[PDB]
Design a protein around this ligand. Structure first.
Ligand SMILES: C[C@@H](c1cccc2c(-c3ccc(NS(C)(=O)=O)c(F)c3)c(C(=O)O)[nH]c12)N1CC(CN2CC(N)C2)OC1=O
Ligand SMILES: [Zn+2]
Ligand SMILES: [Zn+2]
Length: 232
């Protein structure tokens, strides 16, 4: 009923959208992994009379449900998708998207990692993002490579019309008491990567983590703090 939708509020398989700003939504779904249930976020950005999707809904059936929810709530076609790293909460569902007419994109680093891991593989490669601090335009967003953090390939996404910073899994929510799933992380470089984000997007008004509740710029410093303490 208007609050940001939370893990115990979303059955696995269902998707909810949350309006962030004019022409910007997050999508929220839940999935089981190693016997526990987790929420995850993605982004939807209006691109004229089309939509740009950022990240799948973590699984094939969740992603089909995402497309249905978008049709119900927004009613514009998803034409392109970008996955912000190689893990299943970002690319699982790419095959569904690809069969629903959506052109799927990721950096070459993400595509390689996804292939090597046996995850679904976006079709198109996003060049121009291989060095930390690189930025490129993609429809109504800017894609930014901050450096290694949650993963070596993680990208963040900025919506300049709305000053929305979608951190993906490089950014944690304010309630986080740990650094999430760090299997593929670079705990030593992560704070440096976060500092790059802070420097590059000082006017962000909303910051959206890969999992959990949006907030403001404080999510960035909080993330650095939880990662440094996890490393320590
Ligand atoms: C698919 C993905 C994955 C699965 C399950 C949970 C999470 C979590 C996660 C956990 C706790 C919290 N809450 S918190 C900050 O602790 O308070 C959180 F916000 C997120 C994250 C994240 O942190 O982004 N991601 C997850 N995977 C898989 C994976 C490594 N598997 C070995 C093989 N290489 C792939 O690595 C990863 O990320
Ligand atoms: Zn991940
Ligand atoms: Zn994640």
């Amino acid at each position: 009923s208007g609050e940001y939708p939370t893990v115990n509020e979303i059955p696995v398989g269902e998707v909810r959208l949350y309006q962030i700003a004019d022409g910007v939504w997050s999508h929220i779904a839940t999935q089981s992994f190693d016997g526990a249930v987790y929420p995850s976020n993605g982004l939807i950005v209006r691109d004229g009379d089309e939509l740009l999707l950022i990240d799948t809904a973590w699984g094939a059936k969740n992603t089909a449900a995402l497309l249905a929810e978008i049709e119900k709530q927004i009613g514009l076609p998803v034409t392109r998708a970008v996955s912000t790293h190689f893990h299943d909460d970002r690319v699982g569902g790419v095959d569904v998207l690809r069969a629903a007419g959506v052109a799927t994109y990721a950096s070459p680093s993400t595509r390689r990692l996804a292939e090597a891991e046996g995850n679904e593989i976006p079709t198109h490669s996003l060049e121009g993002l291989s060095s930390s601090g690189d930025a490129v335009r993609f429809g109504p967003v800017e894609l930014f490579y901050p450096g290694a953090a949650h993963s070596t390939d993680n990208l963040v996404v900025y919506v300049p019309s709305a000053n929305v910073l979608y951190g993906g899994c490089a950014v944690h929510e304010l309630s986080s008491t740990s650094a999430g799933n760090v299997a593929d992380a670079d705990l030593a470089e992560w704070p440096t990567s976060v500092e790059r984000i802070q420097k590059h997007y000082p006017e962000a008004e909303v910051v959206i983590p890969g999992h959990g509740l949006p907030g403001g710029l404080d999510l960035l410093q909080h993330t650095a703090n939880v990662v440094k303490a996890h490393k320590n």
